Write a protein that binds this ligand. Structure first.
Ligand SMILES: *Cc1c(COP(=O)(O)O)cnc(C)c1O
Ligand SMILES: *Cc1c(COP(=O)(O)O)cnc(C)c1O
Lengths: 448, 445
């Protein structure tokens, strides 16, 4: 019948919206010429972005496969099922003992959700403090203000690292007896060592508690058997599919069924309908795409390289006498203790930003005040993806150091007020010279 | 020194997944979609969703970030703010917006939390009358939605005609003493008396909360009552009728309540979320530019004109509708006339490539064996359907309704049996063919 055109515009973003296209293309390029040392950032590849852009996100699909509110969910169903399967395979667990939910929109969501399923409203949860390397959704609150809902929706007590920066199993086991919570969370944001799960598993049993393991930072190591495996001990294991796993921004919630029969029911309800509506099927498709990469030799070889680059960088840094929290690293992350140079993480953070090196201020055990953090963290997953090898860590080390020394210098010339110091970065030529060296080093590396 | 990543295309890298995805696209092409909460994204939005900006962690707000390297992220979040306020014609001295909530349901738990806090009292419309799960909905078996557990909730209802009961809204409000009143709904075919609610709110010093997810595009284009003039918070999903990606927006009236900005913006982060999804913010920003064009006003017009057109055809064919018509993109048919269930017709229609969903009617007390169905015109409109085509749609439903009565008589009243009828049936095989040829024919974004 006589043609009437759709009411849409399928032209490219370049033609259709020049303003946005330009801003985005400036980001892709800023990315290329930056040395990304943010332990939680990574680069997605073609396949994953292709899924994220897939039309499958048109489909509303509240419910779980074969139990959906709307119809027309056969290919959605097959895809979510393929996702469960790749997820289980990726971590060597079996559908009999373990099940998984792939509908959470991010990690924080996965966490609140899995927590609530376990504990309910004003239930008792226990996790590591933030400044010591816990995540906000581990029950963080500070002073009067309950900062994370996990602190307000639940009763949360926080444990801490000792002075050497390790988790104090004794202090853990204490609070466990004292506060007596219903769930103990481990898995951490910025902890440079492996986690003693056997340990936590026992403390949990003494107190008859749930053992909750957040591997968002180190998911790939677990998968590749390069760290302890929490899946031996834990009742619930969640992870972001981004960061070290190099997938889309989404999350997983794995649950131990043999340890808690009908826990699946509890987890699923919390995700939908307690917390969420329709899933984001492109996220799901994208996550299935990456989990297949994960169960791969090339991905195993990438994971190990991340570990090898990190430890290599630690050597380089210790060789230059820098003081590292816990004095090394079992993983992709490292925290530098900066107080020896009379400089704050904050200051160094701005110095590195100004020379196209991205990292972030961190806390050393001895900073009681999270106000003025005295360290920084750095991670190798982004550089490793971009092809850096162990020998390439020498250069990173030399630069950080150069950056540390330039921080003291300006600090004094312009003052120890962040506002003042910050202005020493604006018109400095010693900074344009480092940025140049950096930008050229970075532009050269492969980019996904 | 080769990078340690495989940039191969999805076809090559993961043919299994690629296949399923393709099968998905063609299922969409060959389906007459009447699901009132589905639409189609266009090339640019999806380009944005795949954009690498998602690689970047932007915990915090523009110029208030934790990490450095957020210059363009900031430009873009701000651009999103700008195009957002602009889309709904409100002003940045009067109104603020938060573009970080990852979905509609999140936008709602966050906003609510920001306004009332733990165990605060909220009042919303009952699911079965068209309130969303996030509007405080609880069963008496369970607290189905977290919104019923984390907050104290009371559900209001609609009357036997299907209209919101303004007096019942106002009785419950005086008895309950809630701090937030929610209006804006999932399967309600008329416009909302925001002014009525603003009155019933003051009289109890509650916040008027408008969730305009289903009808967002109309409000923007002034084809429906504007909640902006009377509400304290407005939430919407940028998908559905607004046709953007899957994300949400919270809009807040500063002038009505100063310092509201901190409460909303803290609720989103760090109370609830973490790193935003910068692809999503981008694609929202992309789509809010389209909303503010003649072409998209011309679109919303058609969605509406097609809806009313379809209600006319259905009414001529003597179907019964809640409220006897629609003021928007949605229509709910009362199926009792045919002694048929929404489930059964849902099933019949899937079998013949027509998507639509069962919906309860004021007579019903349950979410199971509901007596009606819901249909909406946003997607067919996008695909270039006009008023003349609602006649095809109407006959086709009428056929389905008939074939449902028929199969019920033959195969049995229990759904399990009935589902059995739809398999290898040539009257169905034939309708499917009719529908596929028609649908396959239309534009597809
Ligand atoms: C980053 C992180 C999260 C939450 O990530 P989102 O940004 O909310 O997706 C949860 N747990 C850990 C350990 C994390 O590092
Ligand atoms: C669909 C809907 C929501 C929730 O959106 P999701 O993206 O599915 O979480 C909230 N409110 C209304 C009115 C809706 O129609």
């Amino acid at each position: 019948h006589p043609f009437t055109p759709g009411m849409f515009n399928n032209d490219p973003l370049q033609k259709y919206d020049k303003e946005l296209f330009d801003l985005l293309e400036k980001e892709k390029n800023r990315q290329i010429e930056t040395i990304n040392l943010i332990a939680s950032e990574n680069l997605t590849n073609t396949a994953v972005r292709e899924c994220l852009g897939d039309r499958i996100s048109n489909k509303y699909s509240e419910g779980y496969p074969h139990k959906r509110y709307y119809g027309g969910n056969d290919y959605v169903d097959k895809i979510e099922e393929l996702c469960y399967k790749r997820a289980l395979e990726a971590f060597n667990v079996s559908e009999e003992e373990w099940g998984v939910n792939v509908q959470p929109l991010s990690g924080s969501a996965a966490n609140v959700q899995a927590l609530y399923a376990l504990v309910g409203v004003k239930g008792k949860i226990m996790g590591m403090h933030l400044c010591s390397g816990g995540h906000l959704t581990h029950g963080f609150f500070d002073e009067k203000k309950k900062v994370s809902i996990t602190s307000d929706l639940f009763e949360s007590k926080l444990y801490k690292c000792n002075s050497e920066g390790y988790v104090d199993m004794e202090s853990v086991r204490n609070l466990a007896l004292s506060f007596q919570p219903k769930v103990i969370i481990c898995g951490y944001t910025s902890y440079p060592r492996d986690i003693d799960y056997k340990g936590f598993r026992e403390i949990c049993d003494e107190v008859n508690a749930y053992l909750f393991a957040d591997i968002s930072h180190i998911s790939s190591f677990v998968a590749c058997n390069l760290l302890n495996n929490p899946f031996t001990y834990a009742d619930v294991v969640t992870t972001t599919t981004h960061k070290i796993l190099r997938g889309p921004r989404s999350a997983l919630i794995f649950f131990n069924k043999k340890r808690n029969p009908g826990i699946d029911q509890k987890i699923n309800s919390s995700v939908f309908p307690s917390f969420q509506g329709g899933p984001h099927n492109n996220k799901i498709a994208a996550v299935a795409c990456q989990l297949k990469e994960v169960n791969t030799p090339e991905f195993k070889e990438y994971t190990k390289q991340v570990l090898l680059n990190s430890k290599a960088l630690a050597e380089c840094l210790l060789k230059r006498n820098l003081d590292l929290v816990t004095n090394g690293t079992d993983n992709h992350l490292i925290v530098v203790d900066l107080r020896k140079y009379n400089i704050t993480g904050s200051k160094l953070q701005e110095t590195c930003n100004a020379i196209n090196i991205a990292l972030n201020k961190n806390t050393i055990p001895s900073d009681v005040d999270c106000v003025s953090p005295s360290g920084i963290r750095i991670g190798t997953p982004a550089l490793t993806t971009r092809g850096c090898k162990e020998k390439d860590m020498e250069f990173i080390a030399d630069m950080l150091l150069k950056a540390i020394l330039l921080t003291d210098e300006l600090q004094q010339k312009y003052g120890k007020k962040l506002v003042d110091f910050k202005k020493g970065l604006v018109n400095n030529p010693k900074i344009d010279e480092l940025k140049k060296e950096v930008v050229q080093w970075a532009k050269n590396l492969p980019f996904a």
